[PDB]
Amino acid sequence: HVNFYRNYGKTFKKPRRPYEKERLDAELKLVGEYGLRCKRELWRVQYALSRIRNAARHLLTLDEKNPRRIFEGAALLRRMNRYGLLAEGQDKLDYVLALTAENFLARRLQTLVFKAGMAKSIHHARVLIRQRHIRVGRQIVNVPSFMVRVESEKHIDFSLTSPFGGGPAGRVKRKNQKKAS
């Protein structure tokens, strides 16, 4: 029976010590300050960070001039630079270890909407994402964890169908208009 063969895995991990004031309030800091749906999203971010830091740690373990070191060091660095998650003049493969979950949370599309305006709130940013109000190049995106690359960051803009930036007015508009008319 094929389609048994389609792989799939887990994306987060529940924390080791469930009830800690320090971690609990730090995670509430982050979840409220980025307006997230729950702490699953945050835990995905530590999982991705854990993955990349394991890779970077293993790369730093080796020595330079080692072709394995150079190759996926450069691959990891160009991945980071495509996500703009490192700044210019900062490609050293240690500033990958330096970065923290705030960096990933800052690239999510909600945050980018908030920082480009067009939301008037970060929770308003999330909802605008999920009501098909925003495209990237031409395709309307509704996943608030979209992880925009800088080559797409410049022209993140409304859809051509959303009432705010595109075409016809919404259903509340048209009910009010038709009962006025």
């Binding site: 309030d25 509430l28 800091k29 979840v31 409220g32 300050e33 307006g35 997230l36 749906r37 729950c38 929770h123 999330r126």
Partner: protein
């Protein structure tokens, strides 16, 4: 075996109110955020 259900029958019957729902999901973490350390 005589005394089974004693206190759970002793207690008076009372009913809830008709509370307004609290927000779920994002909005619930919102109220927690801006209620713990925004106020």
């Amino acid at each position: 075996l005589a005394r089974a259900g004693k206190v759970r029958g002793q207690t008076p019957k009372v009913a809830k109110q008709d509370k307004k729902k609290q927000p779920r999901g994002r909005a619930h973490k919102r109220i927690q955020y801006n209620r713990r350390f925004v106020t």
